[PDB]
Amino acid sequence: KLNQNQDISQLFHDEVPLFDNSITSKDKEVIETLSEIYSIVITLDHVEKAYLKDSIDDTQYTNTVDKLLKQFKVYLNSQNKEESNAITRLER
Amino acid sequence: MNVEELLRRIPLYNKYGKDFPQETVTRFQMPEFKLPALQPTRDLLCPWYEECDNITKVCQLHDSSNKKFDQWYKEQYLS
Amino acid sequence: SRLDIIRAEMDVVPSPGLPSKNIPLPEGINLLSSKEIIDLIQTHRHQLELYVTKFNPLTDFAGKIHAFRDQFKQLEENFEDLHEQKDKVQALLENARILESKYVASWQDYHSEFSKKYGDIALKKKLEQNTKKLDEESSQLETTTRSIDSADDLDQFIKNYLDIRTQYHLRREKLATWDKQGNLKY
Amino acid sequence: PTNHHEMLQNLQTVVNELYREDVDYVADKILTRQTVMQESIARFHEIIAIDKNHLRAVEQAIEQTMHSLNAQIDVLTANRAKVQQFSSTSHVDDEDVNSIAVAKTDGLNQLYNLVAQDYALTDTIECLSRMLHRGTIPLDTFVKQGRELARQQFLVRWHIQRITSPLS
């Protein structure tokens, strides 16, 4: 746990890389998959905000969403047949 | 918030340690100096001195009166 | 009497007349059977007024007055010196005032540093300014980009916009932290 | 001689009265002038002494104060030299105070940048949203680049998270 002296600056003395062998090959695969699902969630929020802002038509809307909605389904499987939760665990 | 807080909860530093210049010198404020007036008082003395001098002369005049009388008193009732 | 009360009542609100030793005479015994005494009294009352001063001498009084005088004299001489001394001080002070102007000059240049650059408040201000210039420099590049038909340009735009933003937020969060201190080990 | 005697008698009275009048005048208009003649000289003696002391005080006061100035200036010409020197053989950086005020550790510096990058990433996605609305880019483009910046963001958040996770 935590320890005194307000020198908590010590706990963050040197930089930390993104990955460091503590993370296995499969560990990364999950991280990526989660990163993609997250990008699709953000994208779908903007696409719907564009439609409801008449920035795009039913065409563009249905297409773009339908596609993303599909890519998301794949990534939703690369989480089942691949693996608290993953992220919170991998972050240690 | 968690990281946000941690960051701001820890103080920033100046790249240069003791090498960075600081105001180790305070503004030395000069005191007030006032030299007393002398001329006015100097003038106030003259009349006081003069008073004494005139009183003196008044006394001489007064005191010299008996002799002036004797001179007159002589030619009047003597040789 | 009534004539004295008048002289009394006027001048400046007097004091009533104050209610019998004989005074030596000159040599009256030798003066004429009377024609000379009579003439002396009736025609020379003025002379007698002179004669009579002999018995009310002011010699002692004048001495005292003359002493008081000398002191005033001296007193005038003391100021004659106290003036000359105060004269030099009026000059030595003329220097402590010019040298003081020479001081403030140096000091006003020492302070200048820690107020326009090296000063804590200055630095911060200097930073806060740079931060604002960034937030706008970001917005400027936003509008100064009406269309991007060149695919390559897009990336360049995104990279630049994305960088400015990071430089802004970086400094913004830096200031947030600064706003709770002076700056350690100055 | 009653005659010559009575005249001499008259002379005595005139003389005694003339004398009284003389004494009266002197005592009222002359002898009075010395009443506070001493107090006067006294007051003056008091004044010079005071002036004298005041004069000595300021005399010393100014001398000591002068040595303080010719001394306070040496410690000034010196420090001003060291300060105007730090600005030469020591790159006092481009006006960006960022270089001056830095994180206490390299770990922290990293954290600041990751946080900044995190926000900056949103801003960028936000902007491109606007660019799509303005018509500056088609929906097709927005999605690709959008998914990319959003992805690079997930990583940055995980990164920040893995550096701070061990803290409970």
- Based on its alpha-carbon atoms, the radius of gyration of chain A, rounded to whole angstroms, reads 19
- Contact in structure between C97 and B27 (CB atoms under 8 Å): no
CA dihedral angle for residue A12, residue D102, residue C169, residue C125, rounded to 10 degrees: 150
The whole-angstrom distance between C20's CA and the closest CA on chain B is 22
Q: Give me the residue spans of the domains in chain A.
A: 1-92
Quick one: residue A10, left, alpha or beta (phi over 0 = left, psi -120 to 50 = alpha)?
alpha
**What kind of experiment solved this structure?**
X-ray
The whole-angstrom distance between D134's CA and the closest CA on chain B is 33
In order of B24, B79, D60, the CA distances from D68 in angstroms are 16, 88, 12
Say if the Cβ atoms of B42 and C72 lie within 8 Å. Answer: no
* CATH class of the structural domain A1-92: mainly alpha
Q: At what angle do helices D106-134 and D139-164 cross, to 10 degrees?
A: 160
Chains that contact D by 3+ CB pairs under 8 Å?
A: A, B, C
Helices marked H in chain A = 25-51, 58-77, 86-90
Tokens of A81: 């047949």
Say if the Cβ atoms of B45 and D103 lie within 8 Å. Answer: no
Place of tokens 């220097």: C95
Q: How wide is the angle at C-alpha A89 spanned by C-alphas D118 and D124, nearest 5°?
A: 15
Question: DSSP letter at A31?
Answer: H
Q: At what angle do helices C120-143 and C151-178 cross, to 10 degrees?
A: 160
Whole-number Å distance between alpha carbons of A53 and A57: 10
- Looking at domain B1-79, does it have CATH number 6.10.250.1830? yes
Q: What three-state secondary structure class fits C186?
A: coil
Tokens of A5: 């002296």
Say if the Cβ atoms of B35 and D55 lie within 8 Å. Answer: yes
Question: How many domains are there within chain D?
Answer: 1
The whole-angstrom distance between A17's CA and the closest CA on chain D is 8
Tokens of B17: 């340690």
Length of chain A: 92
Q: Give me the residue spans of the domains in chain B.
A: 1-79
The whole-angstrom distance between D131's CA and the closest CA on chain A is 10
State residue A21 phi and psi, 5-degree precision: 55, -15
CA closest to D80 among chain B residues: B21
- H/E element holding D102? strand D101-102
B vs C: CB pairs below 8 A: 124
Chain B partners within 8 Å of C47 (Cβ): 69, 72-73
DSSP code string of C20-37: -PPPPPSSGGGS-TTHHH
State residue C114 phi and psi, 5-degree precision: -75, 60
Of the candidates A80, D98, A12, which has an alpha carbon nearest to the alpha carbon of residue C170? D98
D 71-110: CB under 8 A from C:
72-73, 76-77, 79-80, 83-84, 92, 95-98, 100-101, 104
- D41, D123, D136 ranked by CB distance to C72: nearest: D41
CA closest to C167 among chain D residues: D116
- B2, B31, B55 ranked by CB distance to D61: nearest: B31
Q: What three-state secondary structure class fits D100?
A: coil
